[PDB]
Design a protein around this ligand. Structure first.
Ligand SMILES: [Mg+2]
Ligand SMILES: [Mg+2]
Ligand SMILES: [Mg+2]
Ligand SMILES: [Mg+2]
Ligand SMILES: [Mg+2]
Ligand SMILES: [Mg+2]
Ligand SMILES: [Mg+2]
Ligand SMILES: [Mg+2]
Ligand SMILES: [Mg+2]
Ligand SMILES: [Mg+2]
Ligand SMILES: [Mg+2]
Ligand SMILES: [Mg+2]
Ligand SMILES: [Mg+2]
Ligand SMILES: [Mg+2]
Ligand SMILES: [Mg+2]
Ligand SMILES: [Mg+2]
Ligand SMILES: [Mg+2]
Lengths: 236, 111, 158, 109, 376, 46, 176, 322
RNA sequence: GCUAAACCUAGCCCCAAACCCACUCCACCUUACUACCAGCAACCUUAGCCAAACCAUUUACAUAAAGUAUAGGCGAUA
RNA sequence: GCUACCUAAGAACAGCUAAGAGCACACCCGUCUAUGUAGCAAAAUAGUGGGAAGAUUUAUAGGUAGAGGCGACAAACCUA
RNA sequence: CCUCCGCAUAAGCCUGCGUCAGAUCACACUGACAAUUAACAGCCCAAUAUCUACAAUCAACCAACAAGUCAUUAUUACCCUCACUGUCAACCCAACACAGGCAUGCUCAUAAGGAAAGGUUAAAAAAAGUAAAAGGAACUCGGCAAAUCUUACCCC
């Protein structure tokens, strides 16, 4: 069992890094997840998910320039090479973010909420009620974990004392601080849902081995479960 | 020398100097109509090409100019009454080319 | 390590079971080695420290097959050296507490040629024995000249 | 599939055949272009004497007598380290400053 | 998030044995032996220094302990520095006005079309035993054979004999900007050198007409975004020749672009920007050498021109430096972009549209030939 | 198909699988060498 | 030149060359280290003379002219390589006191046996070595059963050998 | 399977064996402002140009001397383009390889499953000259075809494997520096530079002091026959349709200081023993000795200079096709 | 009358007695049999066939007391 | 080291017609037939056929192991 | 007269039709002696920093999606030179001198490479072919096979 992860890089960069596939195997060598292995070969573009990341010897808000909106192999959401200051980084493009725009990364939570445009990124208390947000944080400084898939957006429901309330695309609620940053607009590459794979072999291009041929009898778990929507999840 | 340990040289140690050389060579008749000026030896297996060049010019004072080496595999398919193999010992072969057109040919021993 | 019967009942299935003791991480101050150890101690040693009135009395008193440890017998080696070398253990300017501490644990303190060899496993007492009598060889010059200078000692009296 | 054969350099693939070699006692090292750097200092030069005016030949004659052995022990050779060691009434402490060290044997043959 | 997955990281040292925690007894380690043992707990070895010096096993001193550690961070532009904002980022570092055509002093120099095509199709078809020779072997050959077309005009003009090309020449030039200590560095291409300097192009009437327009500012991009961000750097600036060298004056820099992969190629809008700072760096290296170090306006402005790359498409440039005061008077640059000799080549015929360079244009060699005869 | 040629030999793959380094690597494999020096084999490995 | 690989051409094909009395190791003790060093390069010049001849005796299918002088010379160098090795091992005891010119130590291998592990002369300390720290000199007590089994296999062969000779001596005493 | 013939050889007496493989007889002899430009392209590399890298001893033939020749030639083509109008219309190639494949003699195959069968034994010279000059028209003749030159071509008495000359099987190219549809098919001057295995010093540290001149002449006999012989094959001529006119080119060899000048003329291609039993045509190579172009440099000045070595370059760069 | 037949003696077994063994030179944990360059490390109840005419608890691993006291689907057996 | 799958970095795919397209070689598979059945062969030969720019084929090294591996389930395959 | 092969390389094996001698379908078996020469191929790199958005496809238009096989710089450290190893063959994996298995590059009919017949007679049966009057599926489980090339429809 000689498996080191390919995930070994200590400095952020722009250039595509040589990704190694796994086929669903562990660090041991047995399979864990099935239907994985043998797609087109790919390279990883390192995404900075912490959207407000201040540069060295830089403090407050700043701006960037959308250089190119590429196509990302490793994820459903196509990305943007964006540059501000003396550095470049990849971010997940929002929809209608064409090349040559300007995005802004606020840090102060204003006395009044911002007229937030389609791509910018403000801390969450500075957004209106009813805005369509994405790439949210479960802690200020954590980095974006939730809404990230292509075309998806969370809506800021209402703002209570030191918190804000987000509805995730599974229509589940969420309790986070107003300090934590979240970008505005839906994630780009919308109408990804209505693509047609077309042939059986295109799944093998994406890296999806076929389902196994053993007929499993459907147990009691397979009924349509109309269940009440889960409670508020608190990160505070 | 052979069957000995060499001193290990780091960067600025002395020259490695060999007294009482352990390895003995032998001069053969070539079997395949070698050129004139080319004279063929039988190096023992632990001896370098430049280790032969300095060995002839040191002791035998032969102005040697070009040396080639090759390793000859001894045949192993020699079976016994015990049906176990006997390996004829593999050896190293020199091809010494003399300088100055010294022009040596192998003489007729046993007239 | 052992086996049990299924419902405390021996004509049912006989099936193995391991009983683990409960482990705690408790701070421990020693008044001889003067440090705050962090030990993975269990409850029984806490109730054996308490009945012996202190940690320092626990290791020095409890016998060789009763600590059942190597970290414990390394403390016994560490503490008995402090009782036999008469170490200035605390710091200077304070000799009155040091003589008091040694007076509390005075019902102990074997000579130090014994206390080096407590708590040593056989395969560790070899390496202690090997190093002390290591003895790189004297050249035979100094032997043979000391046999000839001595040979002139049997000359000059002759 | 042959076990009792000797593993010489002639056997493996290309990566294997180039590595092993025979008992060479190699000289230099390899730098960055597969460029070999022969060190002159690690090449054994021979200390050969001259032989003219030299009285000894590879054989002796039979008329030389038979004599009994004397394995020259260290005790015997101390008895000729005595010629200054009787007048006092030759040794080196270390070999760190010596060029032909005895026990960590610096020299060859 | 922090990159650097924990398993791939260098491991923690194993927990130290408890003998080392006990004061004060001497541990019995395996260091008296000379091998690992599972009993006889592990020793703490003192740190080892190699006393002598070894070039094959050298270790550098740390970065702050190099003897040239300058916290005013330099920003080197070397040959591999690909710009972001194209020519416009280059104009701001070099304090230049762009003029969108070759000057009229050089286009009038041109007021023998089979011999161009025998330089193209020799580089693209007839050059090596391989069919379709790669771009790392027709990018130099196409510009070292167009030069020999215009070294054939030594019959008309004698002053071409005081001109050689130089292959291994470097240079360096530093200048503060606002106040960023910038730097260019040395060439990787041909440097045609002349015994005499060049005639200036813009008159002082047209030089002092360049006080008016503002330089383009490309906010939020920093102007030094993708130069080599750089501590230890040795601030000195120098053209890469010793003094007293005959042929000191550069005429043209023939910068090239090999690396037949298109990501490795220099993306033509970015390649105009590169050869500005190579033209500016060679010009400023003279003004630091002929004159003093005085941040001034030049009395006699120095002119360096440069021809592009990339054997299909050509990029012509002349460039007049007239200020070594950076930080009103501005330099001015004439560029001619995307000239593109020979639209496409067919190395072997397609099936009808036969073998040969389709879409030839003779005029881009005529602009090429103009910049060669500027000295004569 | 035909079913005899199930030893497609190579020497990298032989010594990585049944070499002396592989036998001494695992404590289970060290017992293999001991059972072969006990019996007194001529080749304890490959 | 190359002619000193060969003897005098008045001896070519003579089938008898009169060369006897190999150098007995007592006679080499009397000579100096200068002259023993010059003697080595004379036996080298003559052993190399003989090894050409026997390789040429085998090539032309003939017997050697006089094989009896080849082993005169090889044991002469062996006596010479014995006498010189006495004088170093004489005064290595005087200046150091310690035998085994190569340093070594008794180290127990993996297989539980002890060997004389000779040393191998490195440029780094032993705690920084990639390769030497991959080597293991210890017991790992699963071996301790296989040590006993070989200890009995050695003892059984020894017990067989001691018991033949008593049976062989009895059938000799049953006859004489 | 063909023998691979290396012109820049390390073999001893490799001039004599290369004469037999090529049927060339060797003849010694031959059939002021330039000192400014030649010493300015000499002191540029060795003194005047500044290099950011420390130059090692092994790199000096690759970074100092090899950029010295293409600076020296490129001017001397441009300076003598008035003196010789053929060089303006020429093509100047840099380090662009020359290939020639021919076959010479037979051999019974000594062992194998092909034992006793006659096998013609082939050769290939795959050389890369330093830089070469090609003309659309052909040079003058230097001697008549069917010349006498009664100086007795050598023959070797053993296998050509015995000079360390090995076999490979690979692509058989016949190649003047450019492809077939190139009108500058002929060529007239070739420039070579020896590499650092074959310096003046390395062949003196080893006792082959006599083979200083030979590696100059082995590099010339081989590469010119490789060049001139390939020039004949581009004009339709081959081993059985032998050349009508003789093909000719000349070369200069360099190891930093010392320059050797060679003129070569191909008289025949019928080298196979099917076409070598009624054939009196012999190729001829004329050769100079190596002479130093300068003594040394005292860091700004070429100390002991001979300009006759500059005369024999400018003679080779003068002669014009008829 | 061909094939062949015969042969004693290698050696060995079983005990007694006695506690056994390791450096000519060089090579050997890397792909063992390789002259030469900068990180991990050992300790974990045997199970099961079998007997119980199945199997599910269970089923052996000096003399004498004694196959006794005890144990055991109080049974095979221990 | 066969095979099942996977990983890493490789390779191969003429010709013609117009895309898990068509005809069709190399190559892969093995439909139906006849021979063979201690055979050429412990599964082959001769034709005939399916695919042949891809869910293709294939060289190389590595990985997963038997209370288990793996599997486009045939309870297949894991040195006849 | 065949060429469905051949020649190299890789893998593999490790001297296995070279010379001399010999014992003993037909005279690669045995003993002794000989060779395979590096330049092609192996065997590589002084640190610590720091850089690398723009596929390949004749790379140009064009057109994509499955998103792609190749790049340094800064300073410090550095001037010893061409050692070692592979190189044979009719060959390897299949118990065999086995009609099998076996990657690539060239040759795509061959300038390489080979021999279907021990000799005879010309029975049956069997096999591999070729030719066939007239009829043309009547044969048969079925047009299987062969010979000719093609029509329509079901079931899944
Ligand atoms: Mg599914
Ligand atoms: Mg299903
Ligand atoms: Mg039972
Ligand atoms: Mg039953
Ligand atoms: Mg298809
Ligand atoms: Mg098809
Ligand atoms: Mg499958
Ligand atoms: Mg089923
Ligand atoms: Mg079933
Ligand atoms: Mg071969
Ligand atoms: Mg079989
Ligand atoms: Mg033939
Ligand atoms: Mg017959
Ligand atoms: Mg009919
Ligand atoms: Mg019927
Ligand atoms: Mg019918
Ligand atoms: Mg049919």
């Amino acid at each position: 069992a000689n498996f080191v992860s390919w995930k070994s890089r200590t400095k952020y960069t722009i250039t595509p890094v040589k990704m190694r596939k796994s086929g669903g195997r562990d660090h041991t060598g047995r399979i864990r997840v099935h239907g994985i292995g043998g797609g087109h070969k790919q390279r990883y573009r390192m995404i900075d998910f912490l959207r407000f990341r201040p540069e060295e010897t830089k403090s407050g808000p700043f701006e960037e320039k959308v250089i190119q909106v590429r196509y990302d192999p490793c994820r459903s959401a196509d990305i943007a090479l964006v540059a501000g200051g003396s550095r470049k980084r990849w971010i997940i493009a929002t929809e209608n973010m064409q090349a040559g725009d300007t995005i802004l990364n606020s840090n102060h939570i204003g006395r009044m909420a911002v007229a937030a445009r389609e791509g910018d990124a403000h801390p969450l208390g500075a957004l209106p009620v009813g805005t369509l947000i994405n790439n949210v944080e479960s802690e200020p400084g954590r980095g974006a974990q939730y809404i990230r898939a292509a075309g998806t957006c969370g809506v800021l429901l209402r703002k209570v004392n030191g918190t804000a309330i987000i509805q995730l695309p599974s229509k589940r609620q969420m309790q986070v601080l107003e300090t934590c940053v979240a970008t505005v607009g839906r994630v780009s590459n919308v109408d990804h849902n209505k693509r047609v794979i077309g042939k059986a072999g295109r799944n093998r291009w994406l890296g999806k081995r076929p389902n196994s041929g053993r007929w499993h009898r459907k147990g009691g778990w397979a009924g349509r479960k109309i269940r009440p929507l889960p409670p508020m999840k608190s990160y505070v | 020398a052979r069957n000995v340990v060499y001193p290990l040289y780091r960067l600025g140690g002395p020259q490695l100097r060999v007294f009482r050389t352990n390895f003995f060579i032998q001069l053969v008749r070539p079997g395949v109509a070698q050129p004139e000026d080319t004279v063929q030896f039988r190096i023992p297996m632990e001896m370098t090409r430049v280790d032969l060049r300095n060995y002839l010019e040191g002791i035998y004072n032969v102005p040697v100019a070009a040396v080639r080496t090759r390793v000859q595999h001894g045949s192993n398919k020699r079976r016994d009454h015990r049906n176990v193999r006997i390996k004829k010992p593999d050896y190293k072969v020199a091809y010494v080319q003399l300088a100055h057109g010294q022009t040596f040919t192998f003489p007729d021993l046993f007239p | 390590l052992g086996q049990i019967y299924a419902n405390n009942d021996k004509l049912s299935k006989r099936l193995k079971k391991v009983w683990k003791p409960q482990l705690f991480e408790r701070e421990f101050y020693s008044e001889i080695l003067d440090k705050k150890f962090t030990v993975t101690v269990t409850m029984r040693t806490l109730d054996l420290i308490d009945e012996a009135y202190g940690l320092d009395f626990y290791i020095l008193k409890a016998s060789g097959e009763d600590l059942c440890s190597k970290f414990g017998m390394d403390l016994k080696r560490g503490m008995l050296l402090r009782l036999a070398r008469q170490d200035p253990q605390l710091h200077p300017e304070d000799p009155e507490r040091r003589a008091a501490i040694y007076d509390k644990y005075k019902e102990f303190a074997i000579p130090e040629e014994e206390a080096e060899w407590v708590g040593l496993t056989l395969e560790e007492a070899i390496e202690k024995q090997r190093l002390l009598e290591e003895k790189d060889p004297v050249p035979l010059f100094k032997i043979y000249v000391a046999e000839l200078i001595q040979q002139l000692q049997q000359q000059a009296l002759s | 599939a042959d076990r009792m054969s000797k593993w010489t350099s002639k056997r493996g693939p290309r990566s294997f055949r180039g590595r092993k070699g025979r008992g060479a006692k190699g000289i230099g090292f390899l730098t960055s272009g597969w460029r070999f750097v022969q060190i002159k200092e690690m090449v054994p030069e021979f200390v050969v004497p001259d032989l003219t005016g030299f009285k000894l030949k590879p054989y002796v004659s039979y008329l030389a007598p038979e004599s009994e052995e004397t394995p020259l022990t260290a005790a015997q050779l101390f008895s000729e380290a005595v010629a200054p060691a009787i007048e006092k009434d030759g040794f080196e402490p270390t070999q760190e400053g010596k060029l032909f060290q005895l026990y960590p044997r610096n020299f060859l043959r | 998030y922090e990159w650097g997955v924990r398993s791939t990281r260098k491991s923690e040292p194993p927990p130290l044995d408890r003998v080392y925690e006990i004061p004060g007894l001497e541990p019995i380690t395996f260091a008296g032996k000379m091998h690992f043992v599972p009993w006889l707990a592990r020793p703490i070895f003192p740190p080892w220094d190699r006393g002598y010096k070894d070039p094959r096993f050298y270790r550098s001193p740390p970065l702050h302990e190099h003897p040239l550690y300058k916290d005013q961070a330099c920003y080197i532009f070397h040959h591999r520095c690909r710009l972001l904002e194209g020519v416009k980022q280059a104009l701001w570092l070099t304090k230049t006005k762009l003029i969108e055509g070759l000057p009229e002093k050089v286009l009038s120099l041109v007021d023998q079309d089979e011999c161009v095509l025998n330089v193209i199709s020799h580089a693209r078809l007839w050059q090596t035993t391989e069919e379709i020779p790669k771009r790392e072997t027709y990018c130099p050959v196409i510009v070292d054979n167009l030069i020999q077309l215009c070294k054939s005009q030594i019959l008309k003009h004698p002053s071409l004999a005081r001109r050689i090309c130089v292959q291994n020449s470097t240079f360096s030039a530093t200048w503060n900007r606002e106040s960023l200590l910038l730097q260019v560095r040395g060439s990787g291409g041909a440097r045609l050198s002349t015994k005499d300097p060049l005639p200036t192009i813009a008159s002082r009437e047209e030089i002092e007409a360049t006080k008016n327009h503002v330089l383009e500012t490309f906010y939020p991009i920093s102007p030094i975004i993708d130069l080599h961000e750089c501590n230890i750097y040795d601030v000195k600036n120098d053209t890469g020749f010793q003094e007293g060298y005959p042929y000191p004056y550069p005429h043209t820099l023939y910068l090239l672009d090999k690396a037949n992969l298109r990501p490795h190629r220099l993306q033509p809008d970015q390649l105009r920007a590169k050869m500005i700072l190579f033209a500016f760096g060679s010009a400023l290296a003279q003004a630091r050498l002929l004159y003093g170090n005085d941040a001034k306006v030049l009395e006699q402005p120095v002119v360096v021109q440069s021809v592009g790359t990339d054997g299909r498409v050509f990029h012509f440039l002349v460039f007049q430096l007239n200020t070594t005061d950076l930080d009103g008077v501005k330099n001015l640059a004439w560029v001619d972009s995307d000239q593109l000799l020979y639209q496409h080549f067919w190395c072997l015929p397609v099936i009808v549209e036969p073998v040969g360079p389709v879409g030839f244009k003779p005029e881009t060699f005529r602009k090429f030939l103009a910049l060669y005869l500027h000295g004569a | 198909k035909a079913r005899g040629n199930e030893y497609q030999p190579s020497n990298i793959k032989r010594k990585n699988k049944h070499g002396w380094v592989r036998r001494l690597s695992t404590p289970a494999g060290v017992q293999v060498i001991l059972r072969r020096m006990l019996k007194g084999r001529k080749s304890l490995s490959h | 030149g190359l002619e000193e690989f060969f003897d005098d051409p008045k001896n070519w094909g003579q089938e008898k060359v009169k060369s006897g009395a190999a150098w007995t190791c007592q006679q080499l003790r009397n000579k100096s280290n200068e002259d023993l060093h010059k003697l080595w390069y004379v036996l080298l010049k003559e052993r190399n003379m003989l090894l050409t001849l026997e390789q040429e005796a085998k090539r032309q299918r003939l017997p050697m002219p006089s094989p009896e002088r080849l082993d005169k010379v090889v044991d002469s160098m062996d006596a010479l390589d014995k006498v010189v090795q006495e004088r170093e091992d004489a005064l290595r005891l005087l200046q150091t006191g310690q035998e085994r010119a190569r340093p070594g130590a008794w180290r127990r291998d993996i297989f539980g046996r002890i060997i004389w592990h000779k040393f191998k002369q490195w440029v780094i300390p032993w705690h920084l070595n990639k390769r030497y720290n991959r080597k293991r000199f210890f017991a790992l007590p699963y071996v301790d059963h296989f040590l006993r089994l070989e200890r009995e296999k050695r003892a059984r062969i020894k017990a067989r050998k001691e018991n033949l000779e008593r049976k062989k001596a009895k059938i000799l005493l049953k006859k004489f | 399977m063909k023998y691979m013939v290396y012109p820049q050889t390390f073999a001893l007496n490799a001039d004599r064996w290369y004469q037999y493989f090529t049927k060339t007889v060797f003849l010694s002899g031959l059939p002021a402002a330039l000192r400014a430009v030649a010493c300015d392209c000499l002191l540029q590399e060795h003194f005047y140009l500044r290099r950011r890298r420390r130059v090692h001893r092994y790199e000096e033939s690759e970074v100092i001397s090899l950029p010295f020749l293409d600076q020296l030639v490129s001017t001397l083509v441009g300076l003598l383009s008035p003196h010789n109008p053929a060089l303006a219309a020429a093509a100047l190639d840099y380090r662009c390889p020359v290939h020639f494949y021919w076959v010479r003699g037979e051999e019974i195959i000594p062992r194998g499953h092909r034992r006793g069968r006659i096998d013609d034994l082939r050769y290939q010279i795959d050389d890369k000259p330093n830089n070469q000059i090609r003309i659309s028209k052909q040079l003058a003749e230097f001697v008549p075809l069917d010349y006498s030159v009664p100086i007795e071509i050598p023959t070797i008495k053993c296998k050509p494997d015995k000079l360390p000359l090995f076999k490979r099987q690979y692509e058989n190219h016949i190649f003047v520096g450019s492809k077939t549809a190139d009108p500058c098919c002929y060529g007239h001057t070739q420039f070579h530079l020896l590499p650092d295995k074959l310096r003046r010093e390395r062949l003196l540290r080893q006792n082959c002091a006599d083979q200083i001149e030979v590696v100059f002449r082995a590099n010339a006999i081989a590469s010119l026959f490789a060049w001139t012989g390939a020039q004949a094959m581009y004009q339709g001529f081959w081993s059985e349709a032998d050349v009508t006119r003789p093909f000719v080119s000349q070369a200069v060899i360099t190891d930093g200081k010392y320059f050797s000048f060679f003129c070569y003329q191909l008289n025949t291609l019928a080298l196979t023993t099917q076409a070598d039993q009624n054939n009196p045509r012999k190729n001829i190579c004329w050769g100079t000795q190596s002479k130093p172009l300068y003594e040394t440099i005292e860091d700004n000045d070429v100390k002991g200079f001979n300009d006759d070595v500059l005369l024999q370059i400018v003679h080779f760069l003068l002669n014009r096709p008829k």
